[PDB]
Nucleic acid binder design. Structure first.
Ligand SMILES: [Mg+2]
Ligand SMILES: [Mg+2]
Ligand SMILES: [Mg+2]
Ligand SMILES: [Mg+2]
Ligand SMILES: [Mg+2]
Ligand SMILES: [Mg+2]
Ligand SMILES: [Mg+2]
Ligand SMILES: [Mg+2]
Ligand SMILES: [Mg+2]
Ligand SMILES: [Mg+2]
Ligand SMILES: [Mg+2]
Ligand SMILES: [Mg+2]
Ligand SMILES: [Mg+2]
Ligand SMILES: [Mg+2]
Ligand SMILES: [Mg+2]
Ligand SMILES: [Mg+2]
Ligand SMILES: [Mg+2]
Ligand SMILES: [Mg+2]
Ligand SMILES: [Mg+2]
Ligand SMILES: [Mg+2]
Ligand SMILES: [Mg+2]
Ligand SMILES: [Mg+2]
Ligand SMILES: [Mg+2]
Ligand SMILES: [Zn+2]
Lengths: 97, 91, 96, 201, 25, 150, 226, 127
RNA sequence: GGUGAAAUUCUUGGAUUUAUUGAAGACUAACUACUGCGAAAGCAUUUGCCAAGGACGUUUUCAUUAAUCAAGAACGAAAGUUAGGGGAUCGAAGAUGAUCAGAUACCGUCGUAGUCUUAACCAUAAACUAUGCCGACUAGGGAUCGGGUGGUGUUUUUUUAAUGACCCACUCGGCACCUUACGAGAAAUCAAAGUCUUUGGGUUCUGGGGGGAGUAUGGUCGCAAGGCUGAAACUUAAAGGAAUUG
């Protein structure tokens, strides 16, 4: 039977969406179907902040951050636990955790 | 009335030489016997004299061109890239 | 647009088509504007510019060849040059 | 006659005596009658002009290119052929160019070339269809046609001649060090057979 | 078997039958 | 709605209930009729005449001001066009699309829309032939149509 | 991997930093701090000269380091060596680019990114391409949560930005363009021109690149240095 | 007071590169990689090999004369991962702790506007 | 370099890495969403030109010109075919290194056709919303896209005008969503899949247990690959749908 009203994707009123590639395995997946996450990371990994601060030539250095958008296919997202299998009623919960 | 279904001008060749060779000859013969637009006088009066020579019967200008068409795609792209490089020599 | 201005001039104004009549109108001083096609020969173009310089007549260079100029003035034949003698209810003389 | 490309008769003034000189150039595609042609170091980057190769930018397409400055045209002369300027080297003034065969040549930057492609291209795309068309083609070139196969000959006439069947016998790949009378077949062949895979030019 | 490969096998059989019948005629 | 699309728009005029109107309008029927005639002599379709009369003058609609409609007034005064206005506009849209197609052979959407426009033309022409405002054997052809635009 | 090399060479130790010598990089007078840093080159010999190896070099230095102020920390200036006199290299302007972290921090969802670029020639015959970026912003009291423009707003904004950029680069030399780019007055000009079209935020000149240089002028370079 | 180079750490998976150049980037000082410090292809990209490599480039920089570095961190990029490898952080921390001074950290991973085509096929890497 | 680990491969003639330039072809990141357009296939850098389109507004015009459609026709992803061009990437075939009992598989490194384009073919896809179109009616709820109306509403300009951008209220037309079940259904579920034994608004197409079989045969279209149309003999008691507990 039909599992999802959205057919596992987000495409109502288009027909075709250009694909992207999984960052883990390079599988081609449509852009609306993929498992987009936003990795916004400190550049210095929270344990070297003191060391880089005392090694800095500048005071009040802003310490930039890295920005990356990760696209996952369904297999790689489930295997990497980015999403996991939810119960039948909880599948409908759209909200982030 | 339509005399031939598909051979066209290559109907002069009869049943010889093979249909695939006759098809390629048909495609090139239509192009080399076609009449073309004159870029100087503006009329459809350009015809081939020999391979690579295209003369307008109205204004008597003669342009060097392709063997079977008045301009090849390679020559068009070369004209475009020469114009781009020339424009870069000033800007 | 220039095509719309030309169409309005053809609809409600005085014009002449062609090199001989254009030069005749330039000599008689009746020409208010001359419009020369892109692919006009340079000798004819410089001759018309010299005549227009003597006549103090404005020159417009139409983008597109004689085929496009004939279509723009609404004729089924190619037109190399068109001379606007009287622009009626059109702003082609005031603009450009 | 005998050439697939058209020629252009270009008339210049003699700079030292009052007369006219006529040069036979190979027509580049797009050149017309009544066109002004500009030849020199200061000439502009237009199709038909005769610039030296040190004064064109990279990626320029030229034809009738001198191997050495002054030999008046050696490279890319057949119909549809051209040379691409890969790069310059101003100290020790040399220009690297790509030839129609794919070879990379380093020639002097004072060597001249004609901007554009040799006209008449696409010619070899038409099938000749006929022994008579080949006859009339070679009637204006040279007596190299028709060609009898060496394996149809007698052994007095060819290395491949003879046998109670038509067959070559030894290998048809013949060494570079073979002598004349031995060199029939595939001379100094690095490989044979149908070209599968890239040639790695 | 998978229906796509069953369809491929059927197409190969149909082509072979056409060739054999063309031998006959 | 939209015989040649999936649009379902309901945008329209809503004419008033009062069939005699509008008690602030003081011009006469013969004056608005002669205005209709002078616009038609200037060469305006009934749609354009109705727009100008509704906008520059206060003429709610000529059927309630005069006795009858603008096309009837024009015909009675001898200014009826050779073909009806809507068919004329459909023909001129078809000739513009066809000219664009010979300029751009690879415009598949323009080919599609040309099919739709000429279908609509043939349906109106069949209706007008049936009610005999067009002669029997009136045919729309492209080559004659470009000159029929005038 | 210390022992996996099957053959070191097909054919089968002097310290180079004894040969190398130091040079001092000098920024033009348009920037506040002249002293950029130091570079190495081999000592000049008969076969090879040091200045030939030096004249091509491009040093990308942060504008915060050039101007002494941390509000310039997201812009980098490329300086190209043009002449070697004494023991210090003289550099001219070569380009400007934002930093990656700043650009990625500016790009966010539920807003519109507007970009424009112009190719334009200066007064002293430099050909440049200038890239400007802007983003739609919400008004104060706005309750809807995405603040997009309607694409004709985008076309109008791109038009006014392009005409402002062409007007600002034309009629200025390259040095005057640098002295305009440091205070970011072009951003305020774009804001004042576009405030009637759509609100907008993060208006910037994102990049400047040198497409073409004029013929080299020692007079212009010593006008910049000293 | 300080003389500056640039640090240029390229942390891929399978390896890490730490090499300091001059301010122009044309002259190299001390290219040492994580594969120069281990005996296993597994361990070529480990954080420990990276910190050994960073310690040795720092020793060579202190001997040449450079006292501070501007750090440019890099992942493989292009059509590939754009996530920095396990050794880049360890290399940056070892360079900080060695005695060199730091300024102006930046990420310079090559990002395409609309790449050519990723390797692996449309069904991806099947494991 | 690659990998779970490796090896094939490249490297004192300097690989990898760094810098400065240059060229080529493809692609259009981030912005990018339960957002937009298109008959569908599909469509994402700028600017110009060419024609087209829906919705909205309308006290404009014609007046039943309409709905759905055998025959017939246009368009129709990808792969594929023919001939030029182009041929950077990736990469059916193939070559190779592993893995393995085997491994002409998955994994690694290469690599032809192909991938792009022009001209001409081909007419298929889980071409899917597996939901034909046109019309009417029947429950609440907020959000959003396009247009329109109103508000001494906010902000900006020239404090102050008009604009613009917001806010609030309404409305028409969209892509959708949330809650219920009067109602429907075998159930999953459904605002249509309801208004159906209290069975009739209009119309086209399709199915009649599972196989044999989209086969044979005959047409017809196509260069081909194949497409469209399309059986029977014979065989068989289940195949199948949705849910329940293990
Ligand atoms: Mg299932
Ligand atoms: Mg689809
Ligand atoms: Mg002979
Ligand atoms: Mg023979
Ligand atoms: Mg014999
Ligand atoms: Mg012998
Ligand atoms: Mg023999
Ligand atoms: Mg015999
Ligand atoms: Mg309706
Ligand atoms: Mg209909
Ligand atoms: Mg090297
Ligand atoms: Mg984009
Ligand atoms: Mg949009
Ligand atoms: Mg294989
Ligand atoms: Mg089907
Ligand atoms: Mg279906
Ligand atoms: Mg309904
Ligand atoms: Mg609304
Ligand atoms: Mg709504
Ligand atoms: Mg919609
Ligand atoms: Mg039955
Ligand atoms: Mg049955
Ligand atoms: Mg089941
Ligand atoms: Zn002519």
């Amino acid at each position: 039977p039909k599992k999802r009203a959205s057919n596992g994707r987000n495409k109502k009123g288009r027909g075709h969406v250009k694909p992207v590639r999984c960052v883990n395995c390079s599988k081609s997946i449509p852009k609306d179907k993929a498992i987009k996450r936003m990795a916004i990371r400190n550049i210095v990994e929270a344990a070297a902040v003191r060391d880089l601060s005392e090694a800095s030539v500048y005071p009040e250095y802003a310490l930039p951050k890295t920005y990356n958008k990760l696209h996952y296919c369904v297999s790689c997202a489930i295997h990497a636990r980015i999403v996991r299998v939810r119960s039948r009623e909880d599948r409908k919960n759209r909200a982030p955790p | 009335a339509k005399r031939t279904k598909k051979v066209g001008i290559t109907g002069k060749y009869g049943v010889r030489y093979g249909s695939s060779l006759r098809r390629q000859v048909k495609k090139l013969e239509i192009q080399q016997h076609a009449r073309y637009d004159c870029s100087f006088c503006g009329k459809k009066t350009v015809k081939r004299g020999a391979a690579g020579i295209w003369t307008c019967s109205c204004c008597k200008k003669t342009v060097a061109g392709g063997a079977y068409t008045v301009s090849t795609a390679a020559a068009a792209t070369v004209r475009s890239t020469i114009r781009r490089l020339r424009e870069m020599v000033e800007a | 647009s220039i095509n719309q201005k030309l169409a309005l001039v053809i609809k409600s104004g005085k014009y002449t088509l062609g090199y001989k009549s254009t030069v005749k109108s330039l000599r008689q001083g009746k020409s208010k504007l001359i419009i020369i096609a892109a692919n006009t020969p340079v000798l004819r173009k410089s001759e018309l510019e010299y005549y227009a310089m003597l006549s103090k007549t404005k020159v417009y260079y139409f983008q597109g060849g004689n085929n496009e100029l004939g279509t723009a003035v609404g004729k089924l034949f190619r037109v190399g040059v068109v001379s606007i003698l009287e622009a009626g209810d059109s702003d082609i003389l005031t603009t450009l | 006659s005998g050439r697939g490309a058209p020629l252009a008769k270009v008339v210049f003034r003699d700079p030292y005596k009052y007369r006219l000189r006529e040069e036979i150039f190979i027509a580049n595609e797009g050149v017309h009658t009544g066109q002004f042609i500009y030849a020199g170091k200061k000439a502009s980057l237009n199709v038909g002009n005769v610039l030296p190769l040190g004064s064109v930018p990279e990626g320029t397409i030229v034809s009738n290119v001198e191997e050495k400055p002054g030999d008046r045209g050696a490279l890319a002369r057949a119909s549809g052929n051209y040379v691409i300027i890969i790069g310059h080297n101003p100290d020790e003034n040399k220009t690297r160019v790509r030839l129609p065969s794919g070879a990379k040549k380093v020639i002097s930057s004072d060597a001249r070339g004609v901007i554009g492609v040799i006209a008449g291209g696409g010619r070899v795309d038409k099938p000749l269809l006929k022994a008579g068309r080949a006859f009339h083609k070679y009637r204006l070139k040279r007596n190299s046609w028709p060609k009898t196969r060496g394996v149809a000959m007698n052994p007095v006439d060819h290395p491949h001649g003879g046998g109670n069947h038509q067959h070559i016998g030894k290998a048809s790949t013949i060494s570079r060090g073979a002598v004349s009378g031995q060199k029939a077949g595939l001379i100094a062949a690095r490989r044979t057979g149908l070209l599968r895979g890239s040639q790695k030019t | 078997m998978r229906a796509k490969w069953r369809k491929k096998r059927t197409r190969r059989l149909k082509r072979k039958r056409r060739k054999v019948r063309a031998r006959s005629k | 709605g939209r015989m040649h699309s999936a649009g379902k728009g309901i945008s329209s005029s809503a004419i008033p209930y009062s069939r005699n109107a509008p008690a602030w309008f003081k011009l006469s029927s013969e004056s608005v009729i002669e205005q209709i005639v002078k616009y038609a002599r200037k060469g305006l379709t009934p749609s354009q005449i109705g727009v100008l009369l509704r906008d520059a003058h206060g003429v709610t609609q000529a059927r309630v001001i005069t006795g009858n409609k603008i096309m009837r007034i024009l015909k009675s005064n001898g200014l009826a066009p050779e073909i009806p206005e809507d068919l004329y506009y459909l023909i001129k849209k078809a000739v513009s699309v066809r000219k664009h197609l010979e300029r751009n052979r690879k415009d598949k959407d323009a080919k599609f829309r040309l099919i739709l426009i000429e279908s609509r033309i043939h349906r109106l022409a069949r209706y007008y032939r049936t009610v005999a405002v067009l002669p029997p054997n009136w045919k729309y052809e492209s080559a004659t149509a470009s000159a029929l635009v005038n | 991997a210390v022992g996996k090399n099957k053959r070191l060479s097909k054919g089968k130790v002097v310290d180079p930093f004894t040969r190398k010598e130091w040079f001092d990089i000098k920024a033009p007078s348009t920037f506040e701090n002249r002293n950029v840093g130091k570079t190495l080159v081999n000592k000049s010999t008969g076969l090879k000269s040091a200045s030939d190896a030096l004249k091509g070099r491009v040093v990308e230095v942060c504008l915060a380091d050039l101007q002494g102020s941390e509000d310039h920390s997201f812009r980098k200036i490329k300086l190209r060596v043009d002449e070697v006199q004494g023991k210090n290299l003289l550099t001219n302007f070569h380009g400007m680019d934002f930093t990656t972290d700043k650009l990625r921090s500016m790009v966010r969802k539920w807003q519109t990114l507007i970009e424009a670029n112009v190719t334009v020639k200066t007064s002293d015959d430099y050909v440049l391409r200038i890239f400007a970026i802007a983003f739609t912003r919400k008004q104060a009291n706005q309750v809807k949560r995405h603040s997009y423009a309607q694409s004709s707003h985008i076309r109008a904004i791109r038009k006014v930005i392009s005409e402002i950029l062409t007007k600002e680069v034309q009629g200025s030399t390259l040095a005057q363009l640098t002295s305009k780019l440091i205070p970011e007055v072009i951003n305020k000009e774009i804001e004042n021109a576009t405030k009637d079209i759509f609100p907008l935020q993060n208006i910037h000149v994102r990049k400047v690149k040198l497409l073409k240089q004029p013929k080299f002028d020692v007079g212009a370079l010593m006008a910049l240095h000293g | 007071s300080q003389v500056f180079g640039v640090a240029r750490i390229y942390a891929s998976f399978n390896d890490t590169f730490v090499h300091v150049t001059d301010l122009s980037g044309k002259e190299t000082i001390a290219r040492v990689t994580g594969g120069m410090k281990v005996k296993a292809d597994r361990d070529e990209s480990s954080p420990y090999a990276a910190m050994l490599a960073a310690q040795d480039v720092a020793a060579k920089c202190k001997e040449v004369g450079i006292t501070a570095v501007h750090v440019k961190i890099r992942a493989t990029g292009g059509t590939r991962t754009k996530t920095p490898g396990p050794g880049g952080q360890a290399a940056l921390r070892a360079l900080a702790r060695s005695g060199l001074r730091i300024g102006r950290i930046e990420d310079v991973t090559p990002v395409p506007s609309d790449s050519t085509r990723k390797k692996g096929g449309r069904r991806g890497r099947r494991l």
